[PDB]
C-alpha cells in the first residue's frame, strides 16, 4: 500500500543536461514529436513578447542552441522558464512511454510542484495517459514562457540591468540560513524602515524552507545590500532566479489572467483527475477544477503566493494517510535536493528484463541512423587501387610532376612569366596516367564510342563496379539491393573531355559521352538501378556534397543502397591557366600544407566510388563494413570579405554543429582530415577552427584534451582532386582505419607556418613520421573530415570505426565446397584465374573457415557472366591445383568459350524403391531446413490419413530394418518429393520427368499432375492394399542381361504363362516376375545358355498377375485424386509414351501402371523421336542411386551427362557440389544464396582481387595547341 | 509477426493439399464460401452425404468452417473441390464466395 508522489522542481535545478539527453532520444516516437513541436510552440509565444524582450531573445532553429546560453547565464527568464517546463514534461513523458511506467492514478499517486513545477503538475494531473498529456503539455509550454515574460517585464520596470552584466541575467533570489522565517521577516521590516524604500522595491520573503532556512528575493542591487547586513553565523547562497516571483506587492489577478489568456475557452477542458498537493495554498489537496482554472491557480502560486516548502513534506504525508497508505515512493523530476524528499516525507509516517522486440522493430528509425561504408574503389595518382594509394601515403610520396604530353605541351602552354594569352605560370599536377584505359566490351561500348566518352565516366564505371563486387552486391538478391532501391550520386565540377578532346571532331556520342549527368547515368543504366541519379557541382567540395545528399536519401528512406563518388580528369589547359590567373595554384610544387612558404594548391586527378547503406541493412545482408558515418552538415561562408576566400567563423560553427548532432565531444575525436590546400590563409584559418573545436584550451592555459589530436592533409601527397577531393580524403581515412596507422605528412618542406596556434600546448600534432593508431579495446576511433569550395560552401562529416563483427558464426559441416569464376572475355577469364591463384597462395593456411567463405563470396555474392570456370575440393590446396590445371590449358592455346546462350536443359529421373537404403537422406535432413520441413509436413499428412510415420525413417535409421512395405514406400516417395523440391529451389527447372515403377508417383507431382497429399494418399493406400491381399516370399523378380527375344527363346513356356516381363529397361536389360517356382525354372534355363541373372531384394513380384486382386480397390483410390494437365511432359513407362494431357492420367492409368510392365525403352525411344531428349540434355537422378539415368543414357547416347543426388557409397555434398559445377559451366543460373542459406559459418564476404579488366587505351589526343589561339583568325 | 507466420502455415498446408490452378494468372483462389437458406446442422449432413457419395481422400473433404446463424453458415475446401460441392447446393439455397 505505497503511494508514489510525482514532484517537479523549479529554476534552481540545472536542466541543461536533461535537455541534452532528450535531444539525443530517438527510440520514443511521442517524445521526438513533443520535442519537434515544443520549439514551434515556444517560438510562437516568443513572437508575441514586447520589442524589448524580443531583442534580448536569441535566434534558434532547435532547442540545442539554447542550452549553451542557458549554461552561460545569458538566457532571459521567459525562455529558461519554458525550457525548464519542457525538460520536466519531456522527462516525465519518456519515463511513461519509453520507460513503460504506468500512468499515475488518483488511487495510488499524487502530483506536486514548486514554482514552474506547479505548471507541469496541472498538465500531468489533468491527463490519464501519455497521449492525452502532450496537447495539454504544449499549452503548458506557452503558459510558462508567458509566465517568465510577465515577471521579466515587472522586473525590468522595477530595476534596470547593471553595467557589468555582460548579458548575464542577475539573481533576484537568495537563500538565507541560520534564522527562523518569522525572525528574518522582522529584520526585513527594519531594513525597509531605515532605507525608506518604496513599497515595490522592498525585499520580501519569497519562500519558507525549514525552521532555519528560507529564501529572500529583491532587485539585485537591493538584494545585495540587504544580504550584506546578514552577518555570520547566518548563511547566504545565491540562487539562479532571474526575475521576481512570489510577490503579492508586484503582481495582481490581472497579471495571472494575462498569463493564461493563451488557453482558449472551451467546454472540453479536462479536469484534474489526480490530486495535486498544493501545499502553498489554503487547501493542501486540490482536484476537479478544469485545466484552465487549475493552471491559473498554479500561475498564482508562482507570482502571488510564497513557497511554503516547509509544509511540502507533511502535506504529502497527510494525503497518503487519508487514503490509508503506509509509505510514499518519491518520483522527483528535476527537483533540487530531491534525495532528501524520501526520508522527509516518510518521517511523518510509520514506514524482469525488458522483452525482446519483434524482429525488425528493435532497429531505431531510419532518421539519424549510422550510415555504413561497405566498400570503396578508386584511382589516384601513381595508384591503380586503394592498396597502391596507401603506398603513396605511408611512404610519404609527393606525386606532383610537370604536365605530361598526353594532356598538353608544357613548352607552349607554360611560361615562367606568362604574357601570351591562355599561358599559365604553372604546369604541375598529380595525374592519372592510365586514365584512358577501359574495357569497352564489358560495358557494351563500340571502339568508336569509347573514345568519345569522358574518362571520368569510364573510370566511374570501373570504380563503381569494383566497389559493388567488393561489397558483395548482387541486384535483387536481398531487399536492400533491389534495383528500385539503389541510387547514384557523383561530384563533378568539370567536363574537360567535351571541351578539348572530343570537340576536335564532334561526332554522334558527343553529348552522352561528355555531359556530366551521364556520369551516374551510365552506372544506373549498366547495372539497371532505377533509383535516383544525380550529379553535384559545388566546385572543390562536390564529392562530399554528394555524400551529404546520398546520406539524406538513406535517412529519408528514398533508397536502401547508395553509390557515391567523385571524378576529376584534367584535359583542358584553360582550366589550369584560369586557376593560375586567379592565384589558386602553386607555381613551385605540390600542396605544401602547414608550410610557412605555401603558395597555392596543386591540381590533382582522382576517381573514387563508395557503397553506402543504413547500418542495420548492412548487417542484415552480412555486408562488409569499413567504417560508419555518424553525421554530416553543410553551411556557406557568407561572412567573408571576398567571395573566394573562406572564413573561419562559418567553418567552426559547422564543426560544432556536427559534434552536437552526433552527441560527441572533443576527446571523442582523435584524427582530423583537413581540407588543407596548402595556403597560408587557408591553412591557418582552418587550423584555428579545428583546434578551437577539437583541442580547446582552458582559461588557465592548459589543454582540455586528455589524448593527442592528429591533423593531416592528403593533398600534400596527391594534390587537390577538386570535385573528387572529399572522397579522396575519405578514402585515406578508410585505409588509416584498416592499417591502424597515421601516415607521415610531407607538406612541410622547410618550416612550420607561423600563423598556426601553439599546437603542442593544445596536444595537437602533425605527424612527421608514421604513428600507430590502434583501436581501443571495446572502443572506436572517430574522425572529422573537412572539404570546402572556393564558391563559399563548406562541408564536413564525422566518421566512426565499424562495429565489432559477430563473434559466434558457426562451423560449416560440408566437406566439399565449390568456387565459381566468371568473365565476359577469354582474356579476362585468364586474368581472373591467375589473380585467384595468387590470392590463394597469400591466404593458404590462415584458417579453415576460408574455403566455405571463399565459396559463399564467389557464388552468392557475385554476378556470373558467360565465360565460366569452377573448382571443387575439401581444402584451399585442392582448389588451387584445379584452377592451376585449368589455367595451364588456357595458356596452352585452348581459349575460354562462353556457355551456350539458352543454358542447360534438365530431365529428372525418379528411381524405384529397389535402391533405397538405411540412413538415406539423413545429412540432407539435418542440414537443409526446407528439406526437413517438407518431411515433417508429409509426416503429419500421413498420420492424418492413418498412415505410418515416415519422420522416424530420417531420424532413427534402425527402424529401416523392420519397416513395413507401406512405410518403406511412403519414405521413398516423400524422399523423392523433398529431393525434387530441393533441386528446384536450387535452380533446376525440369524439361521433362521420367519415373520408374514407384518413381512415377513423385514424378507426377514434379510434373504438376497430382498434389503432394494426393500422392501420399495414393501411395499409402496402394501399399496398404498390397499388404492386405498379397503375401511376401511367394513371388520374386529376376533381372536378366539379354534381349526380349533371347529370354523368350530360352525359357520353355510363353510369357504370360510361365512368367511375365515386369520391366523393359534396356536392349539387353529386362526383369522377369512370377512365383518363386516360376523364376527358379526360368533362372536355370537362362543360366543354361550362360545369360547373366540376379534376383531382386523386393519380396513380391510387382507388375505381374500377382497384383490383380487389388486393382478394383486401387481404381477407387485413384478416382479420389484431383488431376490437372502436366506443366512439363511426362515420360511414362506405364504407357511407353510421352504424356502431356490429363486425359491420360485417369484412374485407369494407376491400375494399369501397377499391373502393366515398366516399358522404359518404349517410353524413352518415344521421347527421343519427339526431340524431347538428346545428348545435350542433362539427366539428374531424384532417388537413392544413379539407376534410371543409366537407362536414359543408353537411350539417347553414350556422351550424355548424368548425375546422381544421393549414393550410399559417397558423400551427399560431393555429388551435389560436383553436379552444380557442371550445371554452372553449362550456363545454369543457380540459386547460390539458397545453397549457402542454412550455413551461416560460410556467410562472410572476403576481399578478393578485382575483376581482371581487358584494358585498352581510348584517347582523343589534344593536338596543334589550338587552345592558345582561341579567338584568333585562321593565319 | 504471428499473423504472417499464421497465414504462411495455412498457406503451406493449402499448397501441399491442392496445387494452384492453370488459369489463375496469379490470383489466389477462394477456399471458403458462405451458404444461406439451410441450418448448420442440416448443411453438415449434406456435406457428409456428399462425402459418402463422392471419392475424396479424408484430408481433402469439405468441412463446416463456421456457423453464423439459424440459416447461415460457412463451408471450406480446396477450390476445385469446393466448386464441385457448391454446384450441388441448388436454389433456394445461396452461395457467396
Ligand atoms: Mg466417398
CSV table of N, CA and C in Angstrom, one decimal, chain A residues 538 541-548 632-635 654-655 658 675 785-789 792-797:
chain,number,residue,atom,x,y,z
A,538,UNK,N,29.6,21.5,-56.5
A,538,UNK,CA,29.9,22.6,-55.5
A,538,UNK,C,31.4,22.9,-55.6
A,541,UNK,N,34.2,21.0,-53.4
A,541,UNK,CA,33.6,20.2,-52.3
A,541,UNK,C,32.5,19.3,-52.9
A,542,UNK,N,32.5,19.1,-54.2
A,542,UNK,CA,31.4,18.4,-54.9
A,542,UNK,C,31.2,17.0,-54.3
A,543,UNK,N,32.2,16.2,-54.1
A,543,UNK,CA,32.1,14.8,-53.7
A,543,UNK,C,31.5,14.7,-52.3
A,544,UNK,N,32.0,15.5,-51.4
A,544,UNK,CA,31.5,15.4,-50.0
A,544,UNK,C,30.1,16.0,-50.0
A,545,UNK,N,29.8,17.0,-50.9
A,545,UNK,CA,28.4,17.5,-51.0
A,545,UNK,C,27.5,16.4,-51.5
A,546,UNK,N,28.0,15.6,-52.5
A,546,UNK,CA,27.2,14.5,-53.0
A,546,UNK,C,27.0,13.4,-51.9
A,547,UNK,N,28.1,13.1,-51.1
A,547,UNK,CA,27.9,12.2,-50.0
A,547,UNK,C,26.9,12.7,-49.0
A,548,UNK,N,26.8,14.0,-48.9
A,548,UNK,CA,25.7,14.6,-48.0
A,548,UNK,C,24.3,14.3,-48.6
A,632,UNK,N,26.9,14.6,-40.9
A,632,UNK,CA,27.5,15.4,-42.0
A,632,UNK,C,26.6,16.6,-42.2
A,633,UNK,N,27.2,17.8,-42.4
A,633,UNK,CA,26.5,19.0,-42.4
A,633,UNK,C,27.1,19.9,-43.4
A,634,UNK,N,26.4,21.0,-43.8
A,634,UNK,CA,26.9,22.0,-44.8
A,634,UNK,C,26.3,23.3,-44.4
A,635,UNK,N,27.2,24.3,-44.6
A,635,UNK,CA,26.8,25.7,-44.5
A,635,UNK,C,27.5,26.5,-45.6
A,654,UNK,N,30.2,25.0,-38.1
A,654,UNK,CA,29.9,23.7,-38.7
A,654,UNK,C,30.5,22.6,-37.9
A,655,UNK,N,31.8,22.7,-37.6
A,655,UNK,CA,32.4,21.6,-36.8
A,655,UNK,C,31.7,21.4,-35.5
A,658,UNK,N,28.2,19.5,-36.1
A,658,UNK,CA,28.2,18.1,-36.4
A,658,UNK,C,28.5,17.3,-35.1
A,675,UNK,N,40.8,20.0,-45.0
A,675,UNK,CA,40.9,20.5,-46.4
A,675,UNK,C,42.3,20.7,-46.8
A,785,UNK,N,36.2,15.0,-40.9
A,785,UNK,CA,36.7,15.2,-42.3
A,785,UNK,C,36.1,16.5,-42.9
A,786,UNK,N,36.9,17.4,-43.4
A,786,UNK,CA,36.5,18.6,-44.0
A,786,UNK,C,36.7,18.7,-45.5
A,787,UNK,N,35.9,19.5,-46.1
A,787,UNK,CA,36.0,19.6,-47.6
A,787,UNK,C,35.2,20.9,-48.0
A,788,UNK,N,36.0,21.9,-48.5
A,788,UNK,CA,35.4,23.2,-48.8
A,788,UNK,C,35.5,23.5,-50.3
A,789,UNK,N,34.9,24.6,-50.7
A,789,UNK,CA,34.9,25.1,-52.1
A,789,UNK,C,35.2,26.5,-52.1
A,792,UNK,N,32.3,29.1,-51.6
A,792,UNK,CA,31.9,29.6,-50.3
A,792,UNK,C,31.4,28.4,-49.4
A,793,UNK,N,30.8,27.4,-50.1
A,793,UNK,CA,30.3,26.3,-49.3
A,793,UNK,C,31.3,25.5,-48.5
A,794,UNK,N,30.9,25.0,-47.3
A,794,UNK,CA,31.7,24.2,-46.5
A,794,UNK,C,30.9,22.9,-46.1
A,795,UNK,N,31.6,21.8,-46.2
A,795,UNK,CA,31.0,20.5,-45.8
A,795,UNK,C,32.0,19.7,-45.0
A,796,UNK,N,31.5,19.0,-44.0
A,796,UNK,CA,32.3,18.2,-43.1
A,796,UNK,C,31.4,17.1,-42.5
A,797,UNK,N,32.1,16.0,-42.2
A,797,UNK,CA,31.4,14.8,-41.6
A,797,UNK,C,32.1,14.3,-40.4
